[PDB]
Design a protein around this ligand. Sequence first.
Ligand code: CLA
Ligand code: CLA
Ligand code: CLA
Ligand code: XAT
Ligand code: BCR
Ligand code: PQN
Lengths: 160, 75, 41, 120, 735, 85, 80, 74
Amino acid sequence: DIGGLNPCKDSEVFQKRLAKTVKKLENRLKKYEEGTPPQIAIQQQITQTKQRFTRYADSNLLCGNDGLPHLITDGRWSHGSEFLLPSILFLYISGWIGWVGRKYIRTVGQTSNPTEKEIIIDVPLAISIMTSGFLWPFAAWQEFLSGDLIASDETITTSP
Amino acid sequence: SIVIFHFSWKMQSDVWGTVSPTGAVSHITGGNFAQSSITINGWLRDFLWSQAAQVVQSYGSSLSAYGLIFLGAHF
Amino acid sequence: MKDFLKYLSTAPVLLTAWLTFTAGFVIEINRFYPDALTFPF
Amino acid sequence: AMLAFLGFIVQEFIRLPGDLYSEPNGVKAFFQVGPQPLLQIFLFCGFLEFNMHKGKLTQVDMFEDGKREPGNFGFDPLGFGKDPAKRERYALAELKNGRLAMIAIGGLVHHALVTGHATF
Amino acid sequence: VYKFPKFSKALAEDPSTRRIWYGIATAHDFESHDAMTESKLYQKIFASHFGHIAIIFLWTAGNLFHVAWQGNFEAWILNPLKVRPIAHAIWDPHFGQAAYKAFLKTSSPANLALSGVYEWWYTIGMRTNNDLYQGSFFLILLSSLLLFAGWLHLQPSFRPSLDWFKANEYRLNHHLSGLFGVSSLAWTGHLVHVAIPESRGIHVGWDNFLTVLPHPEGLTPFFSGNWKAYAQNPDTASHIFGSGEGSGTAILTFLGGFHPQTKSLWLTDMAHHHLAIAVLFIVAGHMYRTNWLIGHQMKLILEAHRPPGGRLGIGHIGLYETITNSLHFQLGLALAALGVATSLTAQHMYALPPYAFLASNFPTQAALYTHHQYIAGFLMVGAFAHGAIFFVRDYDPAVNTRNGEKNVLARMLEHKEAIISHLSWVSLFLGFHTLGIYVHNDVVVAFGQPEKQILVEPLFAEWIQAASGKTLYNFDLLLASSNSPASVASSQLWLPGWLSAINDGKNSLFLPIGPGDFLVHHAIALGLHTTTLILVKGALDARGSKLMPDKKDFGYSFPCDGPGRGGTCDISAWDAFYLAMFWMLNTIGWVTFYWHWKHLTLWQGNQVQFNESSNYIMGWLRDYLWLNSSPLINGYNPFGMNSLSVWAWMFLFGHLVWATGFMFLISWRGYWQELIETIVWAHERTPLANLVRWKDKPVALSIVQARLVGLAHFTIGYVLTYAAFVIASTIGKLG
Amino acid sequence: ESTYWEGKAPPSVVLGPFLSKIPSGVLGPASLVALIVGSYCTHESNIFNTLTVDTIYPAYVLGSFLTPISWGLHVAAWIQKMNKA
Amino acid sequence: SHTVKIYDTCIGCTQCVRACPTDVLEMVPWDGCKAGQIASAPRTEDCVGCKRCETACPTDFLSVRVYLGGETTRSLGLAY
Amino acid sequence: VIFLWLSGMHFHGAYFSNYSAWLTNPTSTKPSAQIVWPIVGQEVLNADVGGNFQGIQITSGFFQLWRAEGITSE
Ligand code: CLA
Ligand code: CLA
Ligand code: CLA
Ligand SMILES: CC(/C=C/C=C(C)/C=C/[C@@]12O[C@]1(C)C[C@@H](O)CC2(C)C)=C\C=C\C=C(C)\C=C\C=C(C)\C=C\[C@@]12O[C@]1(C)C[C@@H](O)CC2(C)C
Ligand SMILES: CC1=C(/C=C/C(C)=C/C=C/C(C)=C/C=C/C=C(C)/C=C/C=C(C)/C=C/C2=C(C)CCCC2(C)C)C(C)(C)CCC1
Ligand SMILES: CC1=C(C/C=C(\C)CCC[C@H](C)CCC[C@H](C)CCCC(C)C)C(=O)c2ccccc2C1=O
């Protein structure tokens, strides 16, 4: 399909990889005894390996000639769960972190001892700001509009 | 580092090993310390390159953590 | 317990607690839903 | 929590016509209904949150200017609460019922998880 | 203790050994010499250029002579795929009998030639050890010409003035038209006349060249306008190079792709290429104004280029006087262009091999690519260093400013913080995520579950490959489609040759790529961005910063500003070059590692080894370095030695020089001055040695000198060890 | 002289002492005609008819060179129009 | 010998003079500051370049500046 | 701190080790006193140290020291 890849559900090398891993795990399982915790752990390993391979097969995942899932990150929504949705999730979380950090910096920057409140965090104010970051996309595009997001010329510059 | 390298190679090459039932001594490396530890190329090849085989081929085995720590320590 | 709570509010203790909590919920997500290569949806 | 408890009791009893809306168990109904009906509820609740608090939705933004009685959305179409004498009693009753419903909502959800059938 | 640094009285009065060290390292900084004028500067640079070109020509003549005398060029002609070219003979008294026997080739011990000169000279039509001797003779004559010119232009009546040196329009017209176009025209003349018949078995030497027609019709189609006649009857697909079997009569053709036998570009293709380039450059050489009232005055062009809305300030108004009066701006521009050009040479001479039988010479392919990429990195770092030098000592803010507003160059120092911050952001972004994906693959593969690897298909780059005709990724885009207008347009000119070459698994033309290529390209991008960040930061911050708002008053290269203000180690612009040299070496190492591993897997056939193991770091360490280092380290063992013994010795030598660089970089001065003082006391207080005393007081190397020496050791060891590894690994793995 | 400019349009001297004296009413239509002719020549040498060794047609080639030129002619036409010419 | 320059931003706090290890700087009368004194560098032939003088300077970007130049047995700190 | 470290070592020997199995077969069982939780596929680190045990092989020689001390039980 895309880039010459093929779905992993029809990739023979993918099933060969699964079979080889299961065979190695079973051979390891053979050298232990009865329902002893080592055998239980190896059986859990086998079950998890089978579940992971089955989930990857039924996941709209494209496999190359090596039988490994390749990620299609050109931007198409068909393979949108590989990069685009995790990209949105990370952008949300990281914007949350950056927004709460910036808000805390600007909030304790207007107190008597701004530097003290950076090594000794005001946990009440920190908790107040941190749970308010869920609106960071909206807060950012409400502070940029008011001109409160960017400094203009009070920023320092070197000699040249 | 040089001291521990000397210890490791000398022990593996001229002390450690197995003894046959008839009394024949076979070492881990095979006595290569006497003739190949006298050149820097010998140290590079018959010790570093040769005994680093287990670290680089540890992936997928129970010693894979040693390969990961090898790479991380290089980093 | 007025200065002890202030000590717990210091940067190292707070960072250690936050990173321990963060690693904790990451590890537990990866335990309950392991081997997640793509988005579940 | 009060609305969700009433939702449990009605869902196990009444339910809606259709194959999707056929689970007497609320926990299993959360999965059978699919993501599409739930996401619409999520977006509608978000729209409500935005319009009821009029933009200021966060801990630092709300109550920044004051002039906002906690929990006072002005919602009173049926007119219960014109008399100030019973207003305090109604507020206390709402608070106590809300707390009881939080405890009961946890109880019902965890009963459905440990048994699986229903509340009855 | 005097008279050695004749150009510097300040150094000549130094009572220590620092005078000798600094005399070497400041000999070519003519602008800093005592009693210095601009006219003398340009004249000395001119003479030095002449001497340099003479050195280059002498080096080429020496290569030609040694191939003609001690090589096997004539034998290599008859069997280019089995005979290994010989560079020169060896006479070393330290050889044992075993070394003599191992290095013995034909009649004397000799070195295989990895420069690819055999294929290059064979392609351009050389078939005899007397043709090489003629070239060596002619090149020594040219070197004599250049040395005579260099001497002449220092004579009183023949020394050019500043106006002649700064005559931009004349030099551009002549350089472009004459140099580029006319040299391409002469090269097309040689290509046709000599090379084309020599590839077809007809010898065209310095005797029968006025009587052997390069084309049967003989200049009639050119004047008649029937230029298609020179393309009729090209070389067939069964043509044996150097022989008339299956040859043709055409001299200028479009064929595309490679010769079916030599797996290299068609000679008629390259002649046509050089003719087109010659015409284009001769035309473009008439642009600028000279004594005949027509042309361009580049001052006017630069001044008139200000966007009307206004986003580049006042435009390029002050750039003409800025560039003309600065030799470091021009040097930086030339070095950047040369670096890009040699990167282009490296990237195209492996994908599109231009010389016969060079594709099958794997060691020379690897050596050429590595050499040109290292030269490219050096040239780029030099360009940025000379830009920083221009900022320090040649930049004038008044010239680049008109009534408060700043021109296009002066505005680069206004948002310098923005530029540096965004370079830092890109570098951190790429490094964080490339290392994250690589370490994720490392950990996931190590735990025995390679299926959980993050492998991103390089769809953007595969899209480009499909656009050029590669039907491997099922894109059906531009030239992978037979119905697209791009394909119908050239279906009769060069697609059949181009498609037959791009869609071939044995070529290096557009090598198939996978997730490993994606990750390594992102690593390369990170290296480029970080080297650019260091160099740009040093260039822009050269004139000053917050830690040193008067850095321009201390020059381009100074040790520090002292331990005050928190510490000012490595604060000069020279130190930025010094730090960026490590990053250039690392980036070129990544590029060359990627190229060499990809081509080793391609040549050996186990391309699946790269496609699987290149996604994680341990894959690189185990399958490239550890795997291919086995033939090299066994160049000599306690049992014997091979012809690869010299490469193992060079490997160890490079490691040793690298670690001596580590000495000079980690340990700083001050620790070496007190030790030297102890040694001085020991020498002064010992009998039988008091009779001998130094003339220059022995002192420790200066901070900047120590940084330079450590960098030189680091770089020399780096280059030597990698050259030894790549050459020995290719030779010992691929026969 | 003084090709430097800061107003709405550059002075006519930047066009050279051959285009500085062409009326804009001449350059404009000439630029449009040159662009149309060059586009047609390009589309007749290629695109509509595939190129071949036997079909090069210096008219279409020389013509096609009017497309790059056209760009310059209409730029000069705008410069002349804004400079009251 | 190195070059030492004094700039009128001098506040005459004497910290440079009492930090010089080779007696290069001295305090001289002046009328450009409250203290009525300014640093001077009349013995730069003994300047070693250690830059202790400008490590003790409290003014914003320094009032004493040391420019390293030609080297001498005195400026190189050579006891031999 | 040192006493806490020693207590941890002895606790791992008591609870997460194959010391009892190693006592009965010192020459064929590899000493292991640290088992690894099964997360993110890291359970491969639990090696086949012998004695019906899975864990990380121990190179600190605590098993030999404990045997020399006469410790025969966990
Ligand atoms: C939490 C607040 C915060 C915010 C909003 C930013 C924002 C920014 N940083 Mg930054 N930075 C921060 C903390 C922060 N940084 C810290 C703590 C460090 C020290 C490690 C840095 C080091 C740093 C460098 C070296 C660079 C930036 C750059 C940038 C810019 C581009 C984004 C980037 O590259 O991220 C960079 C982010 C990191 C390197 C990781 C940050 C480390 C953690 C995640 C942040 C700290 C969280 C904090 C403890 C939360 C406490 C708040 C709570 C008490 C309420 C952007 C302006 C780049 C730039 O200039 O581009 C324009 C750049 O080159 N930053
Ligand atoms: C036709 C007349 C002519 C010719 C042939 C030359 C030739 C030369 N002059 Mg020269 N010069 C001329 C007229 C001429 N000049 C005039 C009229 C003036 C006065 C205005 C000068 C003033 C002058 C000075 C002041 C200097 C020279 C120098 C040089 C030499 C440059 C070094 C060299 O060997 O480069 C050889 C280069 C080539 C053979 C070609 C290089 C090929 C390039 C690198 C490939 C580019 C291809 C492509 C663009 C790559 C990019 C890919 C693309 C896709 C973008 C060269 C021999 C310099 C020198 O060394 O003096 C001895 C020097 O300092 N000249
Ligand atoms: C044609 C290109 C070109 C030209 C004309 C110049 C010209 C100049 N450069 Mg420059 N430079 C270039 C390329 C060029 N450079 C490149 C590519 C780089 C990046 C590496 C630099 C980096 C650079 C710096 C950092 C500096 C200069 C400086 C200078 C100026 C003085 C040079 C000097 O004193 O030499 C001195 C010459 C030496 C010290 C000789 C060094 C020889 C090295 C160590 C190699 C020798 C070892 C050899 C390989 C032995 C092999 C070992 C064996 C075992 C195998 C001069 C104007 C200096 C200056 O002040 O400019 C104003 C300065 O600070 N340049
Ligand atoms: C609400 C609650 C949990 C609700 C869970 C919900 C909706 C879960 C929904 C889901 O699961 C499903 C359906 C499907 C999943 O796949 C997805 C999600 C979406 C996750 C728990 C409450 C849990 C509530 C708890 C545990 C309350 C504990 C109260 C205590 C201990 C009180 C003690 C006292 O009251 C006494 C006894 C005497 C007093 O005088 C003093 C005090 C001390 C105050
Ligand atoms: C510091 C400084 C300096 C230097 C700088 C530098 C060194 C730079 C570099 C630069 C560079 C190094 C750049 C580069 C560039 C490149 C480019 C710009 C490219 C382009 C390309 C293109 C555009 C292409 C296109 C295409 C494609 C893609 C496809 C095919 C076809 C075509 C052609 C269309 C100086 C001295 C000046 C001055 C001072 C400052
Ligand atoms: C080893 C070392 C030294 C000591 C090394 C010195 C002094 C060089 C010793 C002389 C070398 C070996 C060259 C000797 C050459 C012969 C004496 C012949 C003379 C050649 C000259 C005439 C050019 C430093 O001085 C130093 C200074 C600053 C940072 C790091 C270091 C550092 O690492």
